Design a protein around this ligand. Structure first.
Ligand SMILES: Nc1nc2c(ncn2[C@@H]2O[C@H](COP(=O)(O)OP(=O)(O)NP(=O)(O)O)[C@@H](O)[C@H]2O)c(=O)[nH]1
Ligand SMILES: Nc1nc2c(ncn2[C@@H]2O[C@H](COP(=O)(O)OP(=O)(O)NP(=O)(O)O)[C@@H](O)[C@H]2O)c(=O)[nH]1
Ligand SMILES: [Mg+2]
Ligand SMILES: [Mg+2]
Lengths: 210, 209
């Protein structure tokens, strides 16, 4: 399989890298917040990574499929409270990777910048669920820490008539790898905040203990 | 200069990334004091892979094997401040492809670099004229405002084919305030010096933090 990038696509990717470098250089000055926290969404093409992040940052949802050109990221400013009987201002950088195999090496090159991973499959696509095992072993091999923080999302929960992944099977996978699991919908917002706030909690607690 | 990627090339790149992650995970788990990373860049053919290989192994291959996107080498060295006490340094030497079809992938590794070894080929005028473009790329894409850069005019052993005048290269390096070495990966001339100068810049910038 040969893949290609047009000039326009190379241009778009370089712009993402340019925005990223500008963001990191501005943290080197005022590191208007307390932490820059970075995580990365991954999983098969079409499962809803881009929609999930857009629902989270803007509360909006597009029906039209615009497959991601390699890599992108979004930003959000949130307040984090140490979960338990406890406010830190968090600048979130949300990396959005393409799922298509043609972008595997480019997207894996950004794992080094990720403190945690939002891993998606599509509740209506059984193969995307069967590939979760491969995504996890790719994360074991390519993450830059031992035992990376991962939150698993079974997305498109609003499409009940098309659901093919049984809750029991997804639960069994989450227990086997010891990772949290949420069933989400980027269309209506269900559990989006909850899944991403849990990932942020995992990251913040791991830093405090280090 | 159409941008394409094959499956076998992705596999090779993914192996480098796998090696990289293993190295980073092993530093977090010693035998040295710092993991110091820098990155070689410049036009295809100027000798980036050759320079790093001469430095780490004292060897040189005549045959051109263009780099498949990205690679890195390693070396364990002792660094002395300016003297000072010997610090054990684990070097990770990133090697980027110069061809445009790898530009996005290679630029994605600037973030891991504490310093840059920028090469042109003393026998290739185009590679010298592209130096200012590479410096501009580093300003736009490095993850600090004034990245440390050492400029190498490589292939100094090819005297009859030399076309870049030393005065012009010295003046270009002085304009940007970067050190300049004329190197040969074939016979080793100035390789150690240029890379030790880059390491010095990085270690001294850290000490001031
Ligand atoms: N009904 C419904 N549709 C969704 C949901 N999430 C995504 N979609 C739809 O599914 C399609 C794929 O979504 P998209 O976010 O682009 O997926 P992706 O994971 O980013 N794909 P890629 O990796 O190729 O960039 C789009 O048509 C989008 O509208 C969801 O929760 N519910
Ligand atoms: N005579 C001589 N040949 C050199 C020198 N440095 C590199 N070469 C030769 O020039 C060719 C290109 O060298 P190479 O290190 O592969 O260049 P590169 O910068 O890594 N190219 P790429 O970006 O495509 O990977 C090879 O044939 C190599 O042997 C040098 O100092 N002297
Ligand atoms: Mg997408
Ligand atoms: Mg090379």
């Amino acid at each position: 399989h040969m893949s290609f990038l047009t000039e326009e696509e190379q241009e778009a990717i370089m712009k993402v890298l340019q925005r990223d470098a500008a963001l990191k250089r501005a943290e080197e000055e005022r590191d208007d917040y307390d932490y820059l926290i970075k995580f990365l969404a991954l999983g098969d093409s079409g499962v809803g990574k881009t929609s999930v992040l857009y629902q989270y940052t803007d509360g909006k949802f597009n029906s039209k499929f615009i497959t991601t050109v390699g890599i992108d990221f979004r930003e959000k400013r949130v307040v984090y409270r140490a979960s338990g009987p406890d406010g830190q201002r968090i600048h979130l950088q949300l990396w959005d990777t393409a799922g298509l195999e043609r972008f595997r090496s480019l997207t894996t090159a950004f794992f080094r910048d990720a403190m945690g991973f939002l891993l998606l499959f599509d509740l209506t696509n059984e193969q995307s669920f069967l590939n979760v095992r491969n995504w996890i072993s790719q994360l074991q091999m390519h993450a830059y820490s031992e035992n990376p923080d991962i939150v698993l999302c079974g997305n498109k929960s609003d499409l009940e008539d098309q659901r093919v992944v049984k809750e029991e099977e997804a639960i069994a996978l989450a227990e086997k790898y010891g990772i949290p699991y949420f069933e989400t919908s980027a269309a209506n917002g269900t559990n989006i905040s909850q899944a991403i706030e849990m990932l942020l909690d995992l990251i913040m607690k791991r830093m405090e203990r280090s």
